Structure 1
Amino acid sequence: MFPEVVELNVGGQVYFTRHSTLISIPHSLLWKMFSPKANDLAKDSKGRFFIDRDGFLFRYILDYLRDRQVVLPDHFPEKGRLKREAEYFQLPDLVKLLTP
């Protein structure tokens, strides 16, 4: 029983997003986590759902879930790292976009 807008804490970076966005990719890690099947998932001191991953790169993960594509900054040094985050969250098509 999740709210419409989910409060995320990724490694100390707070994120708000819609619950429908988290389950946008079936059989993904975020799909397994937030699929109703809500009090067992780990939370932080303020009750926000906690993801134990890099907070800075999670910003671009949410853009993929929203748009099914990701525009990176003009000069980006961490394409390889974002691919590793995409692998963890189980986003096959995002890994393809990041694999040359």
Structure 2
Amino acid sequence: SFPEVVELNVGGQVYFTRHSTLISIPHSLLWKMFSPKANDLAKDSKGRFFIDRDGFLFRYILDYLRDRQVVLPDHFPEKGRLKREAEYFQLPDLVKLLTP
């Protein structure tokens, strides 16, 4: 079973969050990966769960999961890349919020 506080390595960037935050959006990729019905998920050299995506963009994914909204730094030049990340994580609402 997963621990209360999950430690994630996303593309090299380390994030900590509650397990409930990872199953926050029903039917999303993280919902499947972290729903208790673990040993399928890859791990880095220090035993952290590894997510093979851009670690810098994930910071906004996580904020969505926390707040159902995202504030982007001013003049953010990668709205489209973050949109693709949302598509990969199967977060439809976020995909719509980032639609140009």
77-86 or 39-48: bigger deviation: 39-48
Q: SS in structure 2 opposite 1:66?
A: helix
How much does 1:37 deviate? 1.1
Q: SS in structure 2 opposite 1:59?
A: helix
How much does 1:38 deviate? 2.1
How much does 1:41 deviate? 1.5
Runs of 4+ in 1 over 4 A off after TM superposition: none
TM-score, with structure 2 as normaliser: 0.96
CA RMSD in angstroms comes to 0.7
Q: How many residues align?
A: 99
How much does 1:75 deviate? 1.7
How much does 1:74 deviate? 1.4
How much does 1:39 deviate? 2.4
Same amino acid, percent of matched pairs: 100
Which digits, 9 at most, give the CA deviation of each residue in 1:51-81, with x for residues without a partner?
0000110000000000000011112000000
Unaligned runs of 5+ in 2: none
- Distance in 2 (alpha carbons) for counterparts of 1:3 and 1:91: 23
- Distance in 1 (alpha carbons) for counterparts of 2:24 and 2:3: 16
Q: SS in structure 2 opposite 1:62?
A: helix
TM-score, with structure 1 as normaliser: 0.96
Q: SS in structure 2 opposite 1:8?
A: strand
How much does 1:42 deviate? 1.0
Q: SS in structure 2 opposite 1:86?
A: helix
Counterpart for residue 28 of structure 1: 28
- Distance in 1 (alpha carbons) for counterparts of 2:72 and 2:11: 21
